[PDB]
Design an enzyme around this catalytic site. Structure first.
Site, PDB file in Angstrom:
ATOM      1  N   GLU A  27      39.044  31.285  70.230  1.00 30.70           N
ATOM      2  CA  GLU A  27      40.248  30.756  70.819  1.00 30.70           C
ATOM      3  C   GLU A  27      39.844  29.216  70.513  1.00 30.70           C
ATOM      4  O   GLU A  27      39.177  28.470  70.760  1.00 30.70           O
ATOM      5  CB  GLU A  27      40.288  31.145  72.304  1.00 30.70           C
ATOM      6  CG  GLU A  27      41.398  30.087  72.971  1.00 30.70           C
ATOM      7  CD  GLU A  27      40.865  30.222  74.515  1.00 30.70           C
ATOM      8  OE1 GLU A  27      41.285  31.350  75.092  1.00 30.70           O
ATOM      9  OE2 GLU A  27      40.620  29.218  75.185  1.00 30.70           O
ATOM     10  N   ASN A  68      29.144  21.550  84.565  1.00 29.64           N
ATOM     11  CA  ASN A  68      28.603  21.159  83.268  1.00 29.64           C
ATOM     12  C   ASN A  68      27.867  19.783  82.923  1.00 29.64           C
ATOM     13  O   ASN A  68      26.970  19.798  82.233  1.00 29.64           O
ATOM     14  CB  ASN A  68      29.802  21.165  82.364  1.00 29.64           C
ATOM     15  CG  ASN A  68      30.420  22.636  81.639  1.00 29.64           C
ATOM     16  OD1 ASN A  68      29.615  23.670  82.311  1.00 29.64           O
ATOM     17  ND2 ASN A  68      30.957  22.684  80.940  1.00 29.64           N
ATOM     18  N   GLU A 107       6.419  23.946  69.462  1.00 32.42           N
ATOM     19  CA  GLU A 107       5.389  23.553  70.365  1.00 32.42           C
ATOM     20  C   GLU A 107       5.496  24.174  72.065  1.00 32.42           C
ATOM     21  O   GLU A 107       5.139  24.970  72.655  1.00 32.42           O
ATOM     22  CB  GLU A 107       4.987  22.246  70.268  1.00 32.42           C
ATOM     23  CG  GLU A 107       3.991  21.608  71.320  1.00 32.42           C
ATOM     24  CD  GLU A 107       3.118  20.370  70.978  1.00 32.42           C
ATOM     25  OE1 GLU A 107       2.551  19.929  71.626  1.00 32.42           O
ATOM     26  OE2 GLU A 107       3.640  19.414  69.962  1.00 32.42           O
ATOM     27  N   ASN A 137      24.927  29.553  87.471  1.00 35.58           N
ATOM     28  CA  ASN A 137      26.143  28.617  87.894  1.00 35.58           C
ATOM     29  C   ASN A 137      26.252  28.596  89.446  1.00 35.58           C
ATOM     30  O   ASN A 137      26.722  27.779  89.665  1.00 35.58           O
ATOM     31  CB  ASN A 137      27.425  29.324  87.283  1.00 35.58           C
ATOM     32  CG  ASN A 137      27.826  28.235  86.122  1.00 35.58           C
ATOM     33  OD1 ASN A 137      29.021  28.520  85.558  1.00 35.58           O
ATOM     34  ND2 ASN A 137      27.276  27.244  86.008  1.00 35.58           N
ATOM     35  N   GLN A 195      33.435  29.193  75.163  1.00 37.97           N
ATOM     36  CA  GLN A 195      34.322  27.971  75.780  1.00 37.97           C
ATOM     37  C   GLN A 195      33.448  27.219  76.505  1.00 37.97           C
ATOM     38  O   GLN A 195      33.178  25.908  76.406  1.00 37.97           O
ATOM     39  CB  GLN A 195      35.323  28.570  76.762  1.00 37.97           C
ATOM     40  CG  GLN A 195      36.006  27.485  77.539  1.00 37.97           C
ATOM     41  CD  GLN A 195      36.923  28.074  78.641  1.00 37.97           C
ATOM     42  OE1 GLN A 195      36.544  28.752  79.643  1.00 37.97           O
ATOM     43  NE2 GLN A 195      38.348  27.989  78.543  1.00 37.97           N
ATOM     44  N   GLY A 218      33.248  36.886  77.005  1.00 36.37           N
ATOM     45  CA  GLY A 218      33.362  37.889  75.755  1.00 36.37           C
ATOM     46  C   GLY A 218      32.698  37.198  74.739  1.00 36.37           C
ATOM     47  O   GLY A 218      31.999  37.685  73.982  1.00 36.37           O
ATOM     48  N   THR A 219      33.225  36.182  74.230  1.00 37.08           N
ATOM     49  CA  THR A 219      32.797  35.436  72.985  1.00 37.08           C
ATOM     50  C   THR A 219      31.464  34.991  73.042  1.00 37.08           C
ATOM     51  O   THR A 219      30.822  35.415  72.076  1.00 37.08           O
ATOM     52  CB  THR A 219      33.421  34.148  72.652  1.00 37.08           C
ATOM     53  OG1 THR A 219      34.842  34.493  72.732  1.00 37.08           O
ATOM     54  CG2 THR A 219      33.266  33.627  71.297  1.00 37.08           C
TER      55      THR A 219
HETATM   56  N1  LIG Z   1      28.946  25.987  83.636  1.00 42.66           N
HETATM   57  C1  LIG Z   1      29.946  26.610  83.298  1.00 42.66           C
HETATM   58  N2  LIG Z   1      30.092  27.862  83.448  1.00 42.66           N
HETATM   59  C2  LIG Z   1      31.522  28.380  82.658  1.00 42.66           C
HETATM   60  C3  LIG Z   1      32.411  27.354  82.199  1.00 42.66           C
HETATM   61  N3  LIG Z   1      33.375  28.055  81.855  1.00 42.66           N
HETATM   62  C4  LIG Z   1      33.202  29.417  82.241  1.00 42.66           C
HETATM   63  N4  LIG Z   1      31.972  29.520  82.794  1.00 42.66           N
HETATM   64  C5  LIG Z   1      31.513  30.838  83.344  1.00 42.66           C
HETATM   65  O1  LIG Z   1      30.770  31.429  82.363  1.00 42.66           O
HETATM   66  C6  LIG Z   1      31.424  32.680  82.163  1.00 42.66           C
HETATM   67  C7  LIG Z   1      32.099  32.760  80.625  1.00 42.66           C
HETATM   68  O2  LIG Z   1      33.008  31.767  80.338  1.00 42.66           O
HETATM   69  P1  LIG Z   1      33.507  31.421  78.888  1.00 42.66           P
HETATM   70  O3  LIG Z   1      32.342  30.445  78.380  1.00 42.66           O
HETATM   71  O4  LIG Z   1      34.988  30.605  79.023  1.00 42.66           O
HETATM   72  O5  LIG Z   1      33.469  32.883  78.073  1.00 42.66           O
HETATM   73  P2  LIG Z   1      34.024  32.935  76.509  1.00 42.66           P
HETATM   74  O6  LIG Z   1      34.474  31.866  76.186  1.00 42.66           O
HETATM   75  O7  LIG Z   1      34.694  34.195  76.704  1.00 42.66           O
HETATM   76  O8  LIG Z   1      32.425  33.479  75.942  1.00 42.66           O
HETATM   77  C8  LIG Z   1      32.422  32.804  83.115  1.00 42.66           C
HETATM   78  O9  LIG Z   1      32.792  33.987  83.643  1.00 42.66           O
HETATM   79  C9  LIG Z   1      32.242  31.588  84.061  1.00 42.66           C
HETATM   80  O10 LIG Z   1      31.847  32.125  85.235  1.00 42.66           O
HETATM   81  C10 LIG Z   1      32.214  26.079  82.076  1.00 42.66           C
HETATM   82  O11 LIG Z   1      32.770  25.143  81.687  1.00 42.66           O
HETATM   83  N5  LIG Z   1      30.759  25.724  82.526  1.00 42.66           N
END
Ligand SMILES: Nc1nc2c(ncn2[C@@H]2O[C@H](COP(=O)(O)OP(=O)(O)O)[C@@H](O)[C@H]2O)c(=O)[nH]1
Ligand SMILES: Nc1nc2c(ncn2[C@@H]2O[C@H](COP(=O)(O)OP(=O)(O)O)[C@@H](O)[C@H]2O)c(=O)[nH]1
Lengths: 391, 436, 436, 391
Positions: free
Chosen positions: C73, C229, C257, C207, C12, C145-146
């Site tokens: 998802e 982001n 490089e 983060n 995500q 997870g993903t």
């Molecule tokens: N910088 C940033 N961190 C995010 C964002 N969404 C989620 N996270 C962080 O990264 C972890 C993984 O979120 P996500 O990418 O939704 O996981 P996944 O889609 O299940 O792999 C979370 O536990 C958050 O602390 C996002 O848009 N930006």
């Protein structure tokens, strides 16, 4: 039977590129001019057993590979002024342009004539373009000269002074060319417009043109029987020295459908007055996938001036090699009196501006008086009146 | 290969504007405005050859403006030298001591008659090192003595000796909220005559408008001539961008091309210009900017182009590339609402330059030959009369070379110019006849 | 001819960052981010061939990112499709329905085991249409997870099938002020192991740091993941600029490089990055920016590089050209105050790119392989323990493919990585031995 | 007596440009290779009565006119990795590089040998450069091979991994070249630094080099008597197969002043250990405006190893055509044992990093094990020890 091609100006070389592009793909040559595995030595130049280079001079070019010994980079100065291109600036470079050309025909066993791709609205392609047309005749009097001239239209113009350059050049095209294909922007526009939902851009128009060229040039570079040489183009389309202004169409943008489309008003590249206008001399050329039959069938469609003989006045040719992107295509070269329209238009525009001393001074201070300009108009006016009374 | 452009800046204002211009352009092309040097091993961005000259041959090589600064008083050139490092060619910064005392007469036929020689020598030089000269921009304030006097003098000899070269004058008109001499209308009217007869086109910078603008759109309590000058630069930079940087389908639009399109008649070559975005040095969308270009309160001239006729327009964008479609679409729409004449049915130049300035990621300049310029010229003529009527200060000019007859004629010319344009609204044929 | 780069964004966060990145790059190169089209007749700015692919042959031709978006998802990809117009290649936007329930296990060996096939098919495709592939950037958030699961899975198969291709992972670490699953430390620790063993280098985006930054330097009352982001993009854009645009003496610096310089040892390839200027979206001078790049509160990682050793640095400017001298002079001075090791005496890459971003006329990115990254990694390991100690939620992962032994080993790896770096401060020879 | 020149890599072609620049001006040829109005056909190639083209192949070039049929555009991949250039990436293109070369010697009546301009610190000029040096020997065993190699120095380095590439390449320069001119950045730096108040940039250094080249190459392309051919360079400077690493100086940066400057420590382009180092074989070459006299005078200045014979061991030449910008200039090629310094330096650097597994893996995963690397070092170590014990 070799034909030297001369491209001058932005629009001139713009067409060059596009045309020579498919020029290769059609003849199946590589980006560099080699066989990636017909009589083609008419356009390309055989350098060695399997090497060929385009028989063309790029005059006044300002950005792929042509003989950079036979291409002249532009020297600033032309602007949008015809007078400027035909004099002050053209003079500085005409002698050179000419040697570059003559040195291209030196390696020519039997030269047929020239093809010129340019714009009559700019200042380089019109001014310098006219100067060349002139010195080209005064040097190769026996040769044939043909033109692919783009006429300007307000619905895609960038210069206020265009019609002036238009008329001035049209005079030289009248006095020195054996025939000219008028690629009308007003038409190229409308075509491209209703062909692509959004407002057209020079490239889109540029496309239609590229095809029109290859297709018109086809018969000259392929084994066919119709329009073998520029000379035949003449005897087949110019019913008289002065009236040598043709229109060309493309199909498409079945066969009964093709032959229908090829000869369809909306399908032509010129604003000819299809209403009170009449045919004078036609010529169709289909290429790709039983043609010498539906000929008489078509001539009954077209309405030539009365004095012309019923059957005949129209010849149909064929080429097996079609332009890339099509299984088989058309093209129709027509010397139609409706072409008078295009001229009349330019005249009218000219008149308004001119009668008010529109931008006349930039021309006078450049060696082109209003009288000279007026003469240019008055002459083109007659040319059109001519076509008109011939109907 | 590209056209060359030399910029001669006469007077005080002219030179102050010129200094800013040059620093700005320096920065746009990636050239240190104090050393004429750029990153070692590479050449400056765009077509630097246009306004800059190459000095040296390696990388230690410097680039030097194709500019000449002239002024009868050291105050300004002296300062430019202080603040410009080795940027300019020292032998191209002509200066004098006595000044012109706000006297067109002094600058035109007298004290300025002495600097002409040096100034010309320099031109000949800069003109020669040009592969292809293609225009000389005379930057000056028509309101004082030097800029008005030497200005006119220099433009007249520049069109006699040379003449195959186009000359675009960028004349700054004077205003109440910044005036410096009660005779500004004399000087202006006088220089106007030459601008009218010997330049190829005059881009007018009306200070009154600049003031309002710098005070309204830029909202500055009390604007300085420096504030006013910054706007003039934003334009000069933005107009010349079409020469210094490359387009999409064209590599350069010549001052010549640009002018042969805007100037339909010899005495109808007085241009206006508008800018966008006009955001105080403290964002807008393309569509708004195009719309605002044609607002009556955005032209650098105290008039309302919309209440007049457009003889010829020219919109010059920069920054616009990807978003071009939308941009054209807007300007296209605008084009319909515009008042045109019957005798110049179509004349609408449009130019794009990928490279933006150092100020806005996206901007645009309107260069228009509109008739409301006649209104500005009138205002001048009026004030000229309020003075000449009572012959105020005439003596300073009379006893300095001029005569009543000579002065009257000049005032007469100014009149012809003004009526000429007014008529133009109705007919070009008539506007012509008014030229004699 | 230039190197090609494909960007696979898993998860995500990864995909949300990826979407922003792509729109930004689109705009930098002069390409409409909704049509893939640029000004008719001309080609996009810079070396577009780098990250974009040419579709068509005329001018009606479009340019399409060399990117693949994967996610179990639809919520996000579905939205990208909505907001991106015909930009991306539809067959390059792989999505699924059930999701991964914040389960590394699900994504690594299970539900993600099903998408691998399609995803790979796409790579093979994008890999082939490359004249010269030269790096694959996997953009993802190692915390869920993903991104953690499929992330690791995809990087491992990507290094088995291909492998001659470099893989740079841009892993977003999770933080309290934005957490989404109590098991973030499990997922992270798990994905770390792969990042450690199968990627060529991992650029870590912590983060927590992003939050503080977006809240301090950008001063945002309560920052959203979108705010966070945007910073990540500013960097990705700024780092990749050295690939997308040309330099002064070089035309492109390869990811290869760039990486062979920063990564001295296999398990010491975890990079940090800092940015400037960090001015809220509401100006500074080169010297300040360079100075600030090395401030302890500017790195996108919750640590203090200055309290550690720099194994290898890389400063990448853009916008800087004319002012280069001064710029080098400053960074040069900075270089002295920097803590280095004895076994990697000199390793300081510096790159310039004329073209600036769409945000600042001048900016710069610090890419550093510093030891304080070990501190960040520790924090992770700790929290991992707070959970694993009590075996909280373990069952979800155990009953989904994993085992206690497998889990412990992974935790073990994470440890080796952490100690490995610490030792590195003292010796590279030792840091090596700690790798087994 | 024709010499083919091969330039590889950024630094390689960078020198190419600069050198061939004045290469023309010296011989008075135009930007295009024509007479703007000596035996020069050694470097340039006579195409027609008054046309000449540089006898050189541009290998791995990435931006003026050379035969673009004998120049190979770089193919991405080398990076800063020697192993990467000598294997994975070099392989893909070595065969081609070789044909391009051989096809350049085909139009060579009597080939003498080659000159290679490159950097030993990069990955292209070092890796691929070494591969070429190798296949160049395995193909033209009787020909002479000379090198202009730029050694890297931390005070103007851009890669951490440089010394590795340095050593690796130095091994191939030792096993395949008949002589090499070490252009030390550490020296080029210091020179340029104290010559131009501000901190030097690659261009500045690049300059000193360009001159050094032309001046060294001079005697080979001019009518003189000293160092007529690469072979003489050898018999005059290489006192033994292995020890063929030379330094060159330039003067200046009067005549007694020139001869003084030409042989002035600070004036050399290499960090040779002037203290405990001794001369082995010298050679001066002045050009511009009574030389065979002050020879013995100079040899008393220089201190060769003891075993070398008092008078002799030093030869002085002359050329009337001096490099543009000077009335008359110098240049001194010296095979000095102090050159050991440069090696020792590289070694030391190597060692630190290497002993810690600095960036060793990028090399191993690329077909260059640590042992191979170690061997490379151990060998270069000996080479230096060699020069050292010879003192
Ligand atoms: N910088 C940033 N961190 C995010 C964002 N969404 C989620 N996270 C962080 O990264 C972890 C993984 O979120 P996500 O990418 O939704 O996981 P996944 O889609 O299940 O792999 C979370 O536990 C958050 O602390 C996002 O848009 N930006
Ligand atoms: N925009 C602008 N107008 C100025 C400036 N200085 C003076 N002016 C105006 O222009 C007129 C001429 O001033 P200046 O250039 O000093 O005249 P000169 O040097 O005697 O030719 C004055 O009457 C002012 O109204 C300036 O810096 N900028």
């Amino acid at each position: 039977r070799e034909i030297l091609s001369i491209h001058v100006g932005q629009c001139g070389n713009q067409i060059a590129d596009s045309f020579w592009r498919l020029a290769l793909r059609e003849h199946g040559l590589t980006e560099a001019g080699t066989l990636k595995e017909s009589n083609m030595e008419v356009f390309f130049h055989k350098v060695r057993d399997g090497k060929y280079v385009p028989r063309a001079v790029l005059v006044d070019l300002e950005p792929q590979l042509f003989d950079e010994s036979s291409i002249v980079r532009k020297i600033p100065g032309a602007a949008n002024n015809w007078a400027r291109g035909y004099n002050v600036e053209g003079e500085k470079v005409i002698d050179q342009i000419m040697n570059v050309i003559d040195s291209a025909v030196e390696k020519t066993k039997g030269l047929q004539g020239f093809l010129m791709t340019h714009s009559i609205g700019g200042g380089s392609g019109s001014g310098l373009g006219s100067l060349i047309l002139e010195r080209l005749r005064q040097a190769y009097p026996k040769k044939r000269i043909f033109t692919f001239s783009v006429v300007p239209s307000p619905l895609i113009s960038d210069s206020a002074v265009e019609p002036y350059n238009a008329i001035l050049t049209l005079q030289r095209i009248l006095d020195n060319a054996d025939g000219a294909v008028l690629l009308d922007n007003e038409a190229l526009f409308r075509i491209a417009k209703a062909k692509l939902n959004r407002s057209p851009n020079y490239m889109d128009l540029n496309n239609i043109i590229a095809l029109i060229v290859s297709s018109v040039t086809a018969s000259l570079r392929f084994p066919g029987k119709l329009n073998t040489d520029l000379s035949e183009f003449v005897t087949n389309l110019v019913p008289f020295p002065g009236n040598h202004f043709l229109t060309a169409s493309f199909a498409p943008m079945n066969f009964p459908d093709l032959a229908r489309e090829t000869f369809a008003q909306d399908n032509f590249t010129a604003a000819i007055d299809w209403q009170q206008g009449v045919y004078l001399a036609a010529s169709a050329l289909f290429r790709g996938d039983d043609v010498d039959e539906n000929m008489a069938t078509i001539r009954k469609s077209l309405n030539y001036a009365s004095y012309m003989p019923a059957s005949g006045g129209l010849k149909l040719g064929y080429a097996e090699t079609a332009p890339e992107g099509f299984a088989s295509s058309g093209l129709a070269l027509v010397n139609h009196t409706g072409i008078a329209a295009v001229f009349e238009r330019l005249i009218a525009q000219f008149d308004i501006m001119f009668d008010n001393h529109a931008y006349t001074h930039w021309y006078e201070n450049a060696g082109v008086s209003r009288d000279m300009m007026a003469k240019a108009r008055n002459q083109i006016a007659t040319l059109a009146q001519s076509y008109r009374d011939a109907s | 290969k590209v056209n060359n452009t030399i910029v001669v800046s006469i007077g005080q204002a002219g030179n102050q504007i010129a200094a800013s211009f040059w620093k700005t352009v320096c920065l746009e092309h990636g050239i240190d405005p104090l050393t004429g040097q750029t990153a070692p091993g590479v050449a400056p961005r765009g077509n630097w050859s246009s306004f800059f000259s190459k000095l040296g041959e390696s990388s230690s090589g410097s680039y030097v403006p194709r500019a000449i600064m002239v002024d009868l008083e050291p105050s300004v050139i002296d300062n430019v030298k202080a603040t410009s490092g080795s940027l300019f060619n020292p032998a191209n910064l002509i200066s004098r001591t006595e000044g012109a005392g706000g006297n067109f007469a002094v600058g035109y036929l007298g004290a300025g008659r002495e600097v002409l020689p040096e100034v010309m020598s320099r031109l000949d030089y800069e003109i020669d090192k040009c592969d292809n000269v293609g225009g000389i921009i005379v930057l000056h304030a028509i309101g004082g003595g030097t800029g008005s006097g030497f200005g006119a003098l220099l433009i007249e000899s520049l069109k006699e000796k040379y003449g195959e070269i186009p000359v675009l004058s960028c004349a700054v008109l004077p205003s109440p909220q910044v005036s410096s001499v009660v005779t500004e209308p004399y000087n202006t009217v006088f220089a106007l005559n030459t601008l009218r007869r010997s330049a190829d086109a005059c881009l007018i910078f009306d200070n009154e408008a600049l003031f309002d603008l710098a005070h309204r759109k830029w909202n500055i309590e009390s604007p300085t001539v420096d504030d006013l000058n910054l706007l003039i630069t934003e334009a000069l930079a933005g107009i010349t961008a079409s020469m210094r940087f490359s387009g999409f389908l064209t590599v350069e639009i010549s001052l010549r091309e640009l002018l042969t399109n805007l100037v339909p008649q010899p005495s109808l070559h007085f241009l206006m210009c508008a800018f966008a975005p006009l955001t105080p040095p403290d964002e807008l969308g393309i569509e708004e900017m195009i719309k605002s270009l044609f607002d009556n309160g955005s032209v650098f001239a105290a008039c309302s182009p919309m209440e007049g006729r457009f003889l010829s327009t020219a919109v010059l964008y920069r920054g616009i590339m990807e978003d071009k479609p939308l941009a054209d679409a807007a300007l296209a729409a605008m084009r319909e609402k515009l008042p045109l004449t019957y005798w110049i049915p179509t004349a609408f130049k449009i130019g794009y330059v990928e490279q933006p300035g150092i100020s806005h990621r996206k901007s645009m300049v309107l260069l228009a030959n509109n008739t409301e310029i006649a209104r500005v010229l009138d205002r001048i003529c009026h004030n000229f009369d309020k003075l000449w009527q009572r012959k105020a200060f005439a003596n300073w000019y009379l006893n300095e070379g001029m005569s009543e007859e000579q002065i009257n004629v000049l005032r007469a010319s100014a009149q012809e110019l003004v009526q000429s344009y007014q008529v133009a609204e109705e007919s070009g044929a008539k506007a012509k006849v008014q030229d004699s």
